[PDB]
């Protein structure tokens, strides 16, 4: 089995810059290498075949070169639709094998999050559980803190975060913090507050609500 | 055009066997080989095998004993079957077709079938509204969503207004709760002035449990 | 570095 080593693991570039992906093989494989793109929730998409040959329907900004063991996938002027993982594949030797992939992240200007908070629905409360959701929308970069308070008591360990992959159009992220209480706990308190810290805010932003209204 | 359509995602219990059906169109199975590839956290992309135009099979070396590929040319179906699955066989399985009948450059892929190997049981989600309010309006924009809670296994599909609403949608990656069930939210931002006139429905489908829910989300 | 079956994207 030929080992294909892709480097680096993550590539971070700004829109319009050039970018190259390295695929090195554990022995000579000629030009028997293919490149694939994979976007969030997608199947792989064939970009180049045999090191350098074009594929119908693939933007001309994609090109590949190399022979023997050292191979390069190049995007001459990167766009945000290029946010994806990229894999090489060799087939000079059976069985065909793939590299482990390089991630392509995009830089952009700082974008502060828009913060929204959602109380638990009366539908959920009938089940005896309370989820409070804090939405941080369309921000950059990815680092953000969410701090939960219930009647000024700091909440710890009872929340979970999820972050979308980078947006293919505006290169931002969105994040959700879900705070989960029992119905009894929820009913026992009044002020529910989500405090958000991000590089794009000059001071933390707090969205809160009183149970009821 | 050329398409490959796979059967839905599902649970398989440890030691039991995985079956996936690839239904192709835009070409004839008598003219092209169909390959099977998977994507796992442990091994990454991994070519599994192929059934060729004439019915011959080749299996990647670690799978020769527990893999079997068959096809019905007339029905344009390829049947993938793998025996004695363990946890590290949890992966997304794909069928693929190459450019030419004999080659391995995969220009056409199925949508993938996420297979979870787990002793646990299938469980449909409950869907709760994330209702817009003043605490969720900012400068003419309101945010609203659906809380898709306590399901197993992945995946779940979420669209808005039956596909017609796509702008401003964020469906968050699922997170695994300490109960061993997944939870996610799907959000969308919309003009607040449309909350009176327009209807906002998240369409939830949990294919492993045959659970389809349409949740209307209204201001509270 | 590892693929994430939820998003089909590489995460660490």
Numbering used by the authors:
A (entry chain A): 1 to 213
B (entry chain B): 1 to 220
C (entry chain E): 1 to 12
What do the authors say?
Recently, we identified a cyclic, 12-amino-acid peptide that binds in a cavity formed by all four IgG domains of the cetuximab Fab. Based on our observations, the peptide–Fab interaction does not affect antigen binding.
Firstly, we focused on substitutions at position 3. To test whether other side chains could be substituted at position 3 to form additional bonds to the Fab and/or through the water network, we used PyMOL (Schrödinger) to identify side chains and different rotamers and to replace the phenyl­alanine with a glutamine and a histidine. Also, the modelled rotamers placed the glutamine side chain within a suitable distance from several proton donors/acceptors for the formation of hydrogen bonds.
